Every structure is written in C-alpha cells, then in structure tokens.
C-alpha cells in the first residue's frame, strides 16, 4: 500500500476568474498541480508546484477541497488549494500556457469528472 497525493492550485483573481490549463477529453480544462514529494508537506507542495509550473509563489491560500480515492494497493488524495494572493504572474513557465476563465461562463462538463464538486463549490459562494 502506497500513497500518491496531488497538490492542486485554484488561482483566483479579483475578477472571479481562475487560471486553468487546456489539454491537447482532448480540450478539457484542468487546474495546475503536481505530486507531493516525500519529506514535503501539502502546503509546501502546492507552493513548489505553482512556482515550477506557473511562476508564482502562493502567499494567501487555504484548503478548498480534499478528495480521496481508494484503489488496490494505492490511496490517492487530491488537495485543492484556493490561492487568493501571490507573488509573480501565472504563465506557461514550462511550456504549459494557461488562461484565465471567468466562473460565470464555466461549466463543470468542461473539466474531467473528478473536478465536479470543486467547480460547483467555486460557482456558489
Ligand atoms: Na511535480
């Protein structure tokens, strides 16, 4: 039994827009994120992952949602962090250009199914 945990960043600006990436579900939207390494905490992981993939250092953030998946010999945990303040400007730092999408025009169906409960929550408030 081993764990695989993913730190996910929900970067939201002042205009209720979120920074998302598009995939080449050939065009579904996704949140930036990556694996939490051994010896690294969930908070340290989302900061590092965003610094590496998006070019920002999250300063003000909180746990927005936590999803668990139990498969044979593997437990998966997705940590979704709502990032409201940061240093830097999001961009395709490692070739993964993202884009700002307003929540008013976003549909959960545009994201892979795992994101459903997160999008619903984002659009409520
Ligand atoms: Na990574």
Swiss-Prot record:
Q: Which UniProt keywords apply?
A: DNA damage, DNA repair, DNA replication, Hydrolase, Magnesium, Metal-binding, Mutator protein
Q: Which family does it belong to?
A: Belongs to the Nudix hydrolase family.
GO terms for biological process, alphabetical: dGDP catabolic process; dGTP catabolic process; DNA repair; DNA replication; nucleotide-excision repair
The name this protein carries in UniProt is: 8-oxo-dGTP diphosphatase
Which residues of the sequence carry a binding annotation for Mg(2+)? Answer: 33, 53
The protein's role, per its UniProt record: Specifically hydrolyzes both 8-oxo-deoxyguanosine triphosphate (8-oxo-dGTP) and 8-oxo-guanosine triphosphate (8-oxo-GTP) to the related monophosphates, thereby cleaning up the nucleotide pools and preventing misincorporation of 8-oxoGua into DNA and RNA. It prevents replicational errors by removing an oxidatively damaged form of guanine (8-oxo-dGTP) from DNA and the nucleotide pool. 8-oxo-dGTP can be inserted opposite dA and dC residues of template DNA with almost equal efficiency thus leading to A.T to G.C transversions.
The record's NCBIfam families line, in alphabetical order, gives: mutt (TIGR00586), PRK10776.1 (NF008044)
The knockout outcome noted for this protein's gene is: Disruption of the gene increases the rates of A:T to C:G transversion a thousandfold over the wild type level.
